[PDB]
Copies of this chain bind each other. A is one copy, B any other.
Amino acid sequence: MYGKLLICATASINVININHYIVELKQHFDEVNILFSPSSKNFINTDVLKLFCDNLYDEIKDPLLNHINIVENHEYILVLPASANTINKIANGICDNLLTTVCLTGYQKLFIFPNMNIRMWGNPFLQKNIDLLKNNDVKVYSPDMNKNNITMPNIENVLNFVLN
């Protein structure tokens, strides 16, 4: 196994299927923990993930969580699914919630998997920020567009983009 991995889930419709990635990834990484964005809590009951993840970081239960330790405790940090909003915040250094604060601190171990409707993907400001992220050592995976649509990355494809 490759070491501790942290999943930073955002308010993308596909966050409802995040449990599938967890059990799958639990086979390749020592640990697979998770952290959600405030808005993603409107899509699922995050406490359920405690049944699949090694650890769940909840900023509501604990408002004084140490983001620095969280970053040092992991070798890989994935933002999956990654919303246009969080992508753009990270690109501009905006860290107004735990997830986003963790992503600023650990930009060097960051892997972003964009997920959104195709029309949002065409936004000029989003794209400009994606270029900015790439030109600064932040790994941004290119969305799997199959309809013109846009699907969620294959569990194999995520492994390649991170380890390879």
Q: Which residues from chain A sit less than 8 Å from chain B, CB to CB?
A: 13, 16-17, 19-20, 39, 41-45, 47-48, 50-51, 63-64, 66, 68, 71, 83-85, 87-96, 100-101, 104-105, 107, 117, 119-120, 123-126, 128-129, 132, 136-137
CB distance from A44 to the nearest CB of B (A): 5
Q: Which one of B51, B64, B88 contacts A66 once the chains associate, using CB atoms below 8 Å?
A: B51
Q: Which one of B20, B89, B107 contacts A123 once the chains associate, using CB atoms below 8 Å?
A: B107
With A42-B64, A119-B105 in contact, do A125 and B48 touch (Cβ < 8 Å)? no
> Which of A51, A66, A123, A126 is the most central at the interface, judged by chain B CB atoms within 10 Å of its CB?
A123
With A51-B64, A124-B136 in contact, do A94 and B88 touch (Cβ < 8 Å)? yes
Chain B hits for A128, CB < 8 A: 93
Please state if B84 and A88 are interface contacts (CB–CB under 8 Å): no
The CA-CA distance from A125 to B124 in the complex, in Å, is 18
Q: List 26 A-B contacts (CB under 8 A).
A: A13-B51, A16-B19, A16-B48, A17-B17, A17-B19, A17-B20, A42-B64, A44-B44, A44-B45, A47-B64, A68-B117, A68-B119, A84-B101, A85-B94, A85-B100, A87-B93, A88-B95, A91-B92, A91-B93, A92-B125, A93-B123, A93-B128, A104-B125, A105-B117, A105-B120, A105-B123
